[PDB]
């Protein structure tokens, strides 16, 4: 996506679904035996999701014009929005 954005072309990235991304990092982390966070998702799960998402932006006119737009999709387990992910 960033190649489009950098080139100054506007684009949109659908990240469907981040909920399964969390499961993937969960597997990875728990078999690296990193200390397991709540809901068996380590603390840097927040860091993981944030860094991923924060790379969507609308670059300044100075720095081209391309904007990567993001639409993350999170599928709530039972509609429990207080769940960690």
């Amino acid at each position: 996506g960033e190649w489009f954005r950098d080139n100054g072309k506007h684009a949109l990235i659908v990240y469907d679904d981040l909920s399964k991304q969390a499961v993937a990092y969960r597997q990875l982390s728990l078999l690296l035996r990193r200390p397991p966070g709540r809901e068996a998702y380590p603390g840097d799960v927040f860091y993981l999701h944030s860094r991923l998402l924060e790379r969507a932006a609308k670059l300044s006119e100075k720095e081209g014009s391309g904007s990567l737009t993001a639409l993350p999709v999170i599928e709530t387990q039972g509609g429990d929005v207080s769940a960690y992910i």
Partner: peptide, 11 residues
């Protein structure tokens, strides 16, 4: 993993 399941549950 949470609710006891194996961490290899997804794979």
């Amino acid at each position: 993993s949470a609710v006891g399941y194996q961490p290899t549950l997804a794979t």
